[PDB]
Amino acid sequence: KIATTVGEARLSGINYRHPDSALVSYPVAAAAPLGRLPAGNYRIAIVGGGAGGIAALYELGRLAATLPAGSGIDVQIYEADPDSFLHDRAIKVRGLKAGRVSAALVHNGDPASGDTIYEVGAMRFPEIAGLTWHYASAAFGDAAPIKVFPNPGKVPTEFVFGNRVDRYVGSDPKDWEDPDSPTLKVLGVVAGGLVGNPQGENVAMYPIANVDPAKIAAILNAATPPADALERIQTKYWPEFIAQYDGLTLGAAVREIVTVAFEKGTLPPVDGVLDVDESISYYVELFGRFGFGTGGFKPLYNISLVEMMRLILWDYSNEYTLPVTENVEFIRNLFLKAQNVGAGKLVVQVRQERVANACHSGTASARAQLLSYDSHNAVHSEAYDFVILAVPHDQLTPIVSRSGFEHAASQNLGDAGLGLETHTYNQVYPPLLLSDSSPAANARIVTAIGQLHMARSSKVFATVKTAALDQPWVPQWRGEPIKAVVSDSGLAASYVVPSPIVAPEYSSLLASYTWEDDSTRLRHDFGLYPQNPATETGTADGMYRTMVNRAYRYVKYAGASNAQPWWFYQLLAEARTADRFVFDWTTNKTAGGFKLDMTGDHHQSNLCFRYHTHALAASLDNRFFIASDSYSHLGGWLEGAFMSALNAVAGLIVRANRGDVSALSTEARPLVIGLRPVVKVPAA
Amino acid sequence: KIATTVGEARLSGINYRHPDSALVSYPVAAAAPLGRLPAGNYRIAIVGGGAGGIAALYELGRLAATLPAGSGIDVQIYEADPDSFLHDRAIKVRGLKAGRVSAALVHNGDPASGDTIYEVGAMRFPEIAGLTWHYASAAFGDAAPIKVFPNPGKVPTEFVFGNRVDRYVGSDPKDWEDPDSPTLKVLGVVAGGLVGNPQGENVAMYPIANVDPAKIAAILNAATPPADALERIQTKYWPEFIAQYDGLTLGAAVREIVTVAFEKGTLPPVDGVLDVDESISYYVELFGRFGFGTGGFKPLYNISLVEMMRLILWDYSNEYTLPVTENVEFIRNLFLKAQNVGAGKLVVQVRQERVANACHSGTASARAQLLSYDSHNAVHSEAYDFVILAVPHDQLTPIVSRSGFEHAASQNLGDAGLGLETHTYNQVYPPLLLSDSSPAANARIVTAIGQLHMARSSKVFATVKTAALDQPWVPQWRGEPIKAVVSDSGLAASYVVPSPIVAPEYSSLLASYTWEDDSTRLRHDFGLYPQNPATETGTADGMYRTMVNRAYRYVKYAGASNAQPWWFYQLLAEARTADRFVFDWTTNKTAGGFKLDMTGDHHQSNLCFRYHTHALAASLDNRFFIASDSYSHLGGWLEGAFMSALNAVAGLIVRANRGDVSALSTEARPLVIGLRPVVKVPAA
Numbered sequence A, B: 001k002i003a004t005t006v007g008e009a010r011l012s013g014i015n016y017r018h019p020d021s022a023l024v025s026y027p028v029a030a031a032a033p034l035g036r037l038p039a040g041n042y043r044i045a046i047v048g049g050g051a052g053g054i055a056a057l058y059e060l061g062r063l064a065a066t067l068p069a070g071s072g073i074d075v076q077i078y079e080a081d082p083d084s085f086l087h088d089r090a091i092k093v094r095g096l097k098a099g100r101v102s103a104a105l106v107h108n109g110d111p112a113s114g115d116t117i118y119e120v121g122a123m124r125f126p127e128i129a130g131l132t133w134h135y136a137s138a139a140f141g142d143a144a145p146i147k148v149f150p151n152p153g154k155v156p157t158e159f160v161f162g163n164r165v166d167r168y169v170g171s172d173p174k175d176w177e178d179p180d181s182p183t184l185k186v187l188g189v190v191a192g193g194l195v196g197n198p199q200g201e202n203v204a205m206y207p208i209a210n211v212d213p214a215k216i217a218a219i220l221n222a223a224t225p226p227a228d229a230l231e232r233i234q235t236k237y238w239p240e241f242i243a244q245y246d247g248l249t250l251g252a253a254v255r256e257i258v259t260v261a262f263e264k265g266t267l268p269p270v271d272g273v274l275d276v277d278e279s280i281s282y283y284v285e286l287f288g289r290f291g292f293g294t295g296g297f298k299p300l301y302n303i304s305l306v307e308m309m310r311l312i313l314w315d316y317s318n319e320y321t322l323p324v325t326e327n328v329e330f331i332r333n334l335f336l337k338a339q340n341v342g343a344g345k346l347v348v349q350v351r352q353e354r355v356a357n358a359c360h361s362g363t364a365s366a367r368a369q370l371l372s373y374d375s376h377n378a379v380h381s382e383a384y385d386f387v388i389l390a391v392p393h394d395q396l397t398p399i400v401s402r403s404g405f406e407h408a409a410s411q412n413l414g415d416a417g418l419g420l421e422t423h424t425y426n427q428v429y430p431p432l433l434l435s436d437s438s439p440a441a442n443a444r445i446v447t448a449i450g451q452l453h454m455a456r457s458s459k460v461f462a463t464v465k466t467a468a469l470d471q472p473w474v475p476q477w478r479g480e481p482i483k484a485v486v487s488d489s490g491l492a493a494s495y496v497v498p499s500p501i502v503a504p505e506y507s508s509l510l511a512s513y514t515w516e517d518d519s520t521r522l523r524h525d526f527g528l529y530p531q532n533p534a535t536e537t538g539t540a541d542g543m544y545r546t547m548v549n550r551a552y553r554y555v556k557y558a559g560a561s562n563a564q565p566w567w568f569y570q571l572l573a574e575a576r577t578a579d580r581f582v583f584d585w586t587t588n589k590t591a592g593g594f595k596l597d598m599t600g601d602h603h604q605s606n607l608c609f610r611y612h613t614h615a616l617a618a619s620l621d622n623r624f625f626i627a628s629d630s631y632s633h634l635g636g637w638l639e640g641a642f643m644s645a646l647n648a649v650a651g652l653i654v655r656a657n658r659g660d661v662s663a664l665s666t667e668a669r670p671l672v673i674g675l676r677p678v679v680k681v682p683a684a
């Protein structure tokens, strides 16, 4: 049952279809090239060298290899991040970023002989992330070993909320220190109420298709689902769930579930003095700090229930590592494999330039324009046949939103407010061109993008000797030291991760991994933004000491009468002075970590997810596609960036074929035709 | 009719009762001293010299004057902010702050002859903010003149969302450039749906007591309601509204209202051509950017409907200025008045120290302990009879949450992780002491405080000649230039406010006032945190250029042949180079601007609002009270800070009288007994 290789994870998730794209398994769509292109010499730009852009490049490579003699694809990849791996062909980050897949290498002067790696962005990969594992197989092979990510509960864990402490491993109460824990009771109540049972009676509060979500998850993952089930999910049942529940937050749903359980007597008054509403509140907030398997989702309580349900269906918490020292190696290997698969028909050039503007203009074949600035702030203008905008939404906004929403005789585009040179474009149309006649339709996609929610996130790291865990002051549970701590201290979630450069001498002490308001509460103490230290030779000691100080709390345990300062204070203080670190995604140019949908946001994110269907309108001459986890129903996952890239390339194939969906492979067609189109075109 | 003096505003809202405290008009409670104290020589601490702490001092002065000969009150006021007015007897901030009432004086070398003031925090005051005006009258007199705050719609305004532009004043179509504007139509739909009609048919979607909120607002503002009506609101109908709608976001509510109106045919398909869900979505997001009279509430869409409904009942948008050059003068004048009214019986000393911990300890008469650090990090400990903790929630957390939840024989408290000196306290109980026997009751208050939502906010300012508004490219209405701009450019809300140091030569160009995700999106560009410039003589020129560059957008006006760069880009660029500024409340030690409740947050904030009722439990003997807008149902308003102060002093009086509510005035008594108690046992 535990996957031990890339191939075992890959095969576990190969069939899984997400509910907003329930007709199609993306890994099955990706098994062969996505389609065919007419003979030609295509000039394509990819803006962004992260997971989205690089997956898109790989699929373009697969398409290029199918082109006849004399034809080919030339791709210009724009990548503004000076630390990207694409520009590299104590704490080091240079060359160790692929967007939000971002490593920091801790070393003592020789980066080839390092101590540990801080995984600053992506770090844990669901088993049924089928497209992720599909690409991991392309990058590494099916035989490459993987490990269980050491989430809370997967290793011995301490949980602290208010007066409550729990030490546990797993969900078997035999392996909880207090089998009568209220935490365990609330967890069962919330699981019953949200997920329900895969067999038998339906007990969940928020059914899909009048059944528990556990039953729908099994259908979505089936090799051979019942006839019509996937269509009915896609067109009826999941839309009905959204109609009912997209206006309900995760926090509101947890409180409804808790309230019913408290009324029934399943959850008792917290002790003899708490009133009704206070007891209900305590349980809601207790569950909030505990979570679903990856730490407290209290900070994520404003997400739509729809968004949580996507993660429930996916079994999101059951996560693995990649077969790497640094996760960036996955994206770097995919980039190299893209060039190999192109078979010499794909040529790639990297531009260390920031794109400022996209538009359609002029009367040439190559009408998709990109205006960029290089590292000397010099302007460049380049025209393309097709462009894939592979950047998340706040980075995309300035590129797409400043050209208005209809034809313009001329525009002087660029970063004029910065004092940078502009370029005059003539006969201009917006880049995200949903209509030649309706400014509102053009506005809808732009405004949607600009109002997606980027979740805030920060990570505080230090380097500690792994042997620190063996000290008598670190608790042991079930034969191993505590290596995950979930708490209301302000740190939120903390992990003591063995170094992947190796039992290793060192561990990465992820002292605090925060989301949303948990991150906001810390931000004043970070000192430098987005990264402290901002240099390779510094250490964020002052910042880190503020985190240590949040851990300076008197904690009463059942095992001792006199409360002492929390042991975790001592462990955080055991970290070495050098190489203390924080990265704040919020103050990075991404304006946060990743998209999570609020109530009502489905309508915006889904528009983005379906945007590539514009290629069905042959009379619309739109050359731009979008490729990021921002434009998916899995913001915060490689799987979402990869899904979005698959969408983008499928749309581009249809556009290149002037609206002919038959140019997509049989298995890839549903990527376009299984969605509600964003343009109205005739049936069939 | 428009109010023209402090006294006119004061009388307007004198009776208004908020729905969570519907049995009391706070201005009426505050008219006479709140009660009486036994004879004695009291030693009190107030932590924080903002609006909460200073109003609490004022009320303690009033009490002090009533004490008999030989009795008195000594107050130690702790204020950590070096820029506080309390510590003061180009951009200058020193001496110009009272917490989140914060001015920046723009000058050329002589601060007595400045150019303009930037109101960095509080700036606009609802007419019906009765307690605010009550204190403004204490500070300035009833005769002092006030002005209508130049909100969007109160002065000529441009609104931009997607392809839609409107130019307007108020809500009469005759005063809109496009009287058939869809924007104005959606405002009527959403207002009808949320607020409804004060007379006639009930048209609102979310009734209170089965009627439109407008009807309830009239009852809550009556001199002589029903007695029965107030109690029924307090105990039945507002609680039922909470039960129903605390789990519904404002954004979800807006979409429900728009959906029904679109199905009825009150709103047309957008462009004649977007589909049903695209049309509804467009209208929801259009309304989101337009707002309720103070700019778009899109960034606030995650607040509960309960929270928005408090502001609807209060007519919050109808706002005025104070009779000052800088709003901090209000708080300074209240400080000075506190000392005058204490008639010699009040002694005040100011400490420039940061409180690190509070607790009860020991066996002496004075048990309420405060541990603090001065500006060079020396430790101080002092014991008091009573303590008012007048700091917002994130600042309160470290003070109250690190001592555990029950009796402890001894603790070494302080900022040990910062390397600062600790102090040993013996026989220690938590400061927010709700139980002698329940650690969960103690944990509930602490955990609630720590998880309140501090809304993010930032303000970008520059100095501009007022005459820039007379440039030919600045639009005008009846001779008056546009002075407010509400946009989806990233700037959110922009104002050109005439200097109060005076027609004035200069204006404060509030180039961007953002909340929540609107602020997050900008934050990467701020450069220095929380303030750029950090010095008096620097300028945030690079930051401000990024704001000019967000305004560099092609905007199409009706009738025009082509889009042209937005005129507002030109206006922003007219600001002088010197004195460009941002302040980010999020990276200040407050960890944001002010409390706004998410879905499910009622129970956390309401617990805090009712906390002072612990005074009813005589044997408990808890000496700590809390006083901030964080512990109110008006986070983001002085009114909330003042209400919480009034609560804190009322509770203090009851506690000083060993639980006897007859020590409060007849008018003040409901401050305590009109709320559900926080201690169920013992009764009181």
Ligand SMILES: Cc1cc2nc3c(=O)[nH]c(=O)nc-3n(C[C@H](O)[C@H](O)[C@H](O)COP(=O)(O)OP(=O)(O)OC[C@H]3O[C@@H](n4cnc5c(N)ncnc54)[C@H](O)[C@@H]3O)c2cc1C
Pocket: A047, A048, A049, A050, A051, A052, A053, A078, A079, A080, A081, A084, A098, A099, A100, A101, A120, A121, A122, A123, A124, A125, A126, A353, A354, A355, A356, A390, A391, A392, A395, A457, A458, A585, A590, A592, A593, A594, A627, A628, A629, A630, A635, A636, A637, A638, A639, A640, A641
């Ligand atoms: C804190 C955090 C935790 C996460 N946890 C996980 C996890 O455990 N598992 C998982 O699967 N995923 C996780 N993710 C999500 C995963 O990192 C993202 O889904 C994925 O990396 C996003 O790829 P992308 O291509 O959409 O965007 P990005 O990674 O943001 O890449 C975009 C690229 O475009 C470039 N760029 C942007 N603007 C421009 C411009 N104007 N011109 C030129 N270049 C530009 C950028 O420099 C960047 O390299 C996490 C992310 C973060 C930040």
Ligand SMILES: Cc1cc2nc3c(=O)[nH]c(=O)nc-3n(C[C@H](O)[C@H](O)[C@H](O)COP(=O)(O)OP(=O)(O)OC[C@H]3O[C@@H](n4cnc5c(N)ncnc54)[C@H](O)[C@@H]3O)c2cc1C
Pocket: B047, B048, B049, B050, B051, B052, B053, B078, B079, B080, B081, B084, B098, B099, B100, B101, B120, B121, B122, B123, B124, B125, B126, B353, B354, B355, B356, B390, B391, B392, B395, B457, B458, B585, B590, B592, B593, B594, B627, B628, B629, B630, B635, B636, B637, B638, B639, B640, B641
């Ligand atoms: C951007 C913004 C816009 C706003 N707009 C409006 C508006 O237009 N109208 C309106 O009525 N209100 C407005 N408000 C709200 C208003 O400013 C607040 O409600 C009010 O000022 C808060 O007072 P307070 O006493 O609760 O807290 P604060 O003002 O935060 O004061 C707390 C004080 O305690 C001190 N302190 C904190 N921690 C410690 C410690 N450990 N030891 C010692 N001292 C400490 C601080 O330095 C500070 O001086 C706005 C606020 C902001 C920030």
Ligand SMILES: Nc1ccccc1C(=O)O
Pocket: A124, A294, A635, A636, A637
């Ligand atoms: N990567 C994520 C995205 C969304 C929510 C949680 C996670 C998590 O890793 O727990």
Ligand SMILES: Nc1ccccc1C(=O)O
Pocket: B124, B294, B635, B636, B637
């Ligand atoms: N001061 C506020 C608090 C809450 C929401 C709006 C405002 C405003 O001034 O518009």
